[PDB]
């Protein structure tokens, strides 16, 4: 709403790759949690049995 | 596939607006390049 288009766009385009950095190392950390929780599940499913 | 020429005639302090993303008189109100342009501008001096 304060920066020209043909300026903001960098801008933007600066901040889009930061937040998508930084939702990309959400996901990883995600998934190795989930692995982790995977491992215990898989344990917690045997010890059951 | 096919080129298009724009001609037309400025003024020096002007020039600097005929480019992708420019504000100005001349960008805003006579002629307005988009930001993806793929050309070339040229320009020359008439005083003679």
Sequence with gaps: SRLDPPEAEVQIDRLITGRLQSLQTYVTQQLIRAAEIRASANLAATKMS | ?48
């Design chain 2, 1 to 48: 596939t096919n080129v298009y020429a724009d001609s037309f005639v400025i003024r020096g302090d002007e020039v600097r607006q005929i480019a992708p993303g420019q504000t100005g008189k001349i960008a805003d109100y006579n002629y307005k390049l988009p930001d993806d342009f793929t050309g070339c501008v040229i320009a020359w001096n008439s005083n003679n």
